[PDB]
Design a protein around this ligand. Structure first.
Ligand SMILES: NS(=O)(=O)c1ccc(CN(Cc2cccc(OCC(=O)O)c2)S(=O)(=O)c2cccnc2)cc1
Ligand SMILES: NS(=O)(=O)c1ccc(CN(Cc2cccc(OCC(=O)O)c2)S(=O)(=O)c2cccnc2)cc1
Ligand SMILES: [Zn+2]
Length: 260
C-alpha cells in the first residue's frame, strides 16, 4: 500500500529499510560473486531451461523497469535441476541497467559491474500460485544473466523495438510470440546462492541462479533502454536509468559454482 520507493537519492536503496525492514536481513540480494571463494559443487544436478512452449503476453513499464509477462496457468516454460527441487514456472522477465556502460547490473563478479542484468522470474509450482510461492523460502527462482556492450543480440531486438510504445509508467503493449530463448548465452554454467527479491518487498524467498557467461548486446540496444521514463505521461521527464540495487552483505552464505 502507498509505495513511494524508487532509485533516486531521496527514495533509493539506502531508504528502503524504513518501509521494508528485511532490507537489512541475513539473505539479501544482489551480492558480489567472489569467483575465488565460490566452490564447485559436484552435487548440483544438471540445469534444465525448458522454454520451447513459452507464451509471452504483454510488455509493461511499471515505473521501476519494463517487464514481459508469460502465461503461467500451466507448465509451459519451466526451470528445473541445478540447485532446484521440483518445477519452477516462468512468469515474467525484466531488466536492470545503468546510465553508462560500466554500471547497471545488480550482481557483480569480483566487483565488476556489467551494463545491465536480465532477471527471468520463476515460481515453485508446489505452492500453486506465484503469490503463495513468493512467501516461501524455496518459492522463487530467478535466472540472472549479465549484459555486456559489444555485438548486437538478435533475440533482444524485438524488445528494443517496442520500448518507444511504453515510454512512461503505466503503459503496456501486446508482446505475444516472443521467444525468451533468444536472451540466453551459449553456456548454462552458473553460480547459485539463497537470496531475496532485489526490489521491495525484498522477500527472502529466491534461489538465485546467475549465469557465468554474459550476453553481448549493442550500444544501440542498451541506449534504447535508457530512453524509458520513470515518470507517467504528462509528468516531468526522469530517465529510467540506474534502476539497480547495489551488492548487499553475503553474511552466512556460500555461493556454489556449477563448473570447475
Ligand atoms: N519505501 S521507502 O522506504 O524507500 C520511501 C518511502 C517514501 C519516501 C518519501 N518521498 C515522498 C513522496 C511523495 C509523493 C510522491 C513521491 O514519489 C515521487 C517519485 O516517484 O519520485 C514521493 S519524497 O522524499 O517526497 C520523494 C519525492 C520524489 C523523489 N524522491 C523522493 C522515501 C522512501
Ligand atoms: N529483481 S527481482 O528479480 O529480484 C524481482 C522479481 C520479482 C519481483 C516481484 N515480486 C515477487 C513475485 C514474483 C512473481 C510473481 C509474483 O506475484 C505475486 C506477488 O504479488 O508476490 C510475485 S512482488 O513484489 O511480490 C509482486 C509481483 C508482481 C506484482 N506485484 C508484486 C520483484 C523483484
Ligand atoms: Zn530484477
Amino acid at each position: 500500500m502507498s509505495h513511494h520507493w524508487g532509485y533516486g537519492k531521496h527514495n533509493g536503496p539506502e531508504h528502503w529499510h524504513k518501509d521494508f525492514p528485511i532490507a537489512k536481513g541475513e539473505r539479501q540480494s544482489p551480492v558480489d560473486i567472489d569467483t575465488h571463494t565460490a566452490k564447485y559443487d559436484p552435487s548440483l544436478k544438471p540445469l534444465s531451461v525448458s522454454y520451447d512452449q513459452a507464451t509471452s503476453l504483454r510488455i509493461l513499464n511499471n515505473g521501476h523497469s519494463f517487464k514481459v509477462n508469460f502465461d503461467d496457468s500451466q507448465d509451459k516454460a519451466v526451470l528445473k535441476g541445478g540447485p532446484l527441487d521440483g518445477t519452477y514456472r516462468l512468469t515474467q522477465f525484466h531488466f536492470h541497467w545503468g546510465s553508462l556502460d560500466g554500471q547497471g547490473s545488480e550482481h557483480t563478479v569480483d566487483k565488476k559491474k556489467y551494463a545491465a542484468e536480465l532477471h527471468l522470474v520463476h515460481w515453485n509450482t508446489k505452492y500453486g500460485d506465484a503469490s503463495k510461492a513468493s512467501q516461501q523460502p524455496d518459492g522463487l527462482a530467478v535466472l540472472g544473466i549479465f549484459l555486456k556492450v559489444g555485438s548486437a543480440k538478435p533475440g533482444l531486438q524485438k524488445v528494443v523495438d517496442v520500448l518507444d510504445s511504453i515510454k512512461t509508467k503505466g503503459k503496456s503493449a501486446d508482446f505475444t510470440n516472443f521467444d525468451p530463448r533468444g536472451l540466453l548465452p551459449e553456456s548454462l554454467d552458473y553460480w547459485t546462492y539463497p537470496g531475496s527479491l532485489t526490489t521491495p518487498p525484498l522477500n527472502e524467498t529466491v534461489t538465485w541462479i546467475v549465469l557465468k557467461e554474459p550476453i553481448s548486446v549493442s550500444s544501440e540496444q542498451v541506449l534504447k533502454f535508457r530512453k524509458l521514463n520513470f515518470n507517467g505521461e504528462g509528468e516531468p521527464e526522469e530517465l529510467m536509468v540506474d534502476n539497480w540495487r547495489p551488492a548487499q552483505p553475503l553474511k552466512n552464505r556460500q555461493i556454489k559454482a556449477s563448473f570447475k
